[PDB]
């Protein structure tokens, strides 16, 4: 599968001025566009070489749309302050994410459109793209408004049509990277804890996409105890890193194996000290 996602954050500035607005666009785990209200250009900007192919009409259109998005979020911050009976003195945050997935068959798989206020679920379009999950009575008010205005129907037209057409266009134009998997480069390190104990760390580096599974086995059976698994992290060059560790009795390192599953690996890998 593949995905296109846009992420929007607006943060009110009660001391002075309008909200800080940041928009970012992703295809899978690759950022391809940005807008920041604090930046100089006041344009949607490219963040991958393959989107720089797009002509002036594209960049003018996305700038117009992203600025309209910015203003909607400013208004939202005002509206929500009213719904929740909050003062003008405090800073608050709205977040919105939307986008689409195509499945293994390259056809529409799923669409998303969801919203949070101060980091809590507000309203989300359900998977059927015809109904809403409103978290509380403020979001219920939004739900009533959006149902009367046929918002779901408008979003569904985008998510099932235009959204997937954009995604497919981008996937072709950026295929050299977007449709290339980078298999994890793996190795093991050994860290003596005492005369009796040692930590084995299994490394996965320079992989894309970010999805990966690292598991330990002892004598060919899974082990969670005395293990540690770090959160997957960006290398900074568009690839990702992860490690898993297990503490073992010194001299028994041979018993343990690290197993790595990734889209770029035809069959999963096994490492052993």
């Amino acid at each position: 599968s593949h995905s296109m996602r846009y992420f929007f954050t607006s943060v009110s500035r009660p001391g002075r001025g309008e909200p800080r607005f940041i928009a970012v666009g992703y295809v899978d785990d690759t950022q391809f566009v940005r807008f920041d209200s604090d930046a100089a250009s006041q344009r949607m900007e490219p963040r991958a070489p393959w989107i720089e192919q797009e002509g002036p009409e594209y960049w003018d259109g996305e700038t117009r749309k992203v600025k309209a998005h910015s203003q909607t979020h400013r208004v939202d911050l005002g509206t929500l302050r009213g719904y929740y009976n909050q003062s003008e003195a405090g800073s608050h945050t709205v977040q919105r994410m939307y986008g689409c997935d195509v499945g293994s068959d390259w056809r529409f798989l799923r669409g998303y459109h969801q919203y949070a206020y101060d980091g809590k679920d507000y309203i989300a379009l359900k998977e059927d793209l015809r109904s809403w999950t409103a978290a509380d009575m403020a979001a219920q008010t939004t739900k009533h408004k959006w149902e009367a205005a046929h918002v779901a129907e408008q979003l569904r037209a985008y998510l099932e049509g235009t959204c997937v057409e954009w995604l497919r266009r981008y996937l072709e134009n950026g295929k050299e990277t977007l449709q290339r998997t980078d298999a994890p480069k793996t190795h093991m390190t050994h860290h003596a804890v005492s005369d009796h104990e040692a930590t084995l760390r299994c490394w996965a580096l320079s992989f894309y996409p970010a999805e990966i599974t690292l598991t330990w086995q002892r004598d060919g059976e899974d082990q969670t105890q005395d293990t540690e698994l770090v959160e997957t992290r960006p290398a900074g060059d568009g690839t990702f890193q992860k490690w898993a560790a297990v503490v073992v009795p010194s001299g028994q390192e041979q018993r343990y194996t690290c197993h790595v599953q990734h889209e770029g690996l035809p069959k999963p890998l096994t490492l052993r000290w």
Partner: peptide, 9 residues
């Protein structure tokens, strides 16, 4: 490409 019209809460 972005949504042409974003709904306000």
């Amino acid at each position: 490409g972005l949504l042409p019209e974003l709904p306000a809460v």
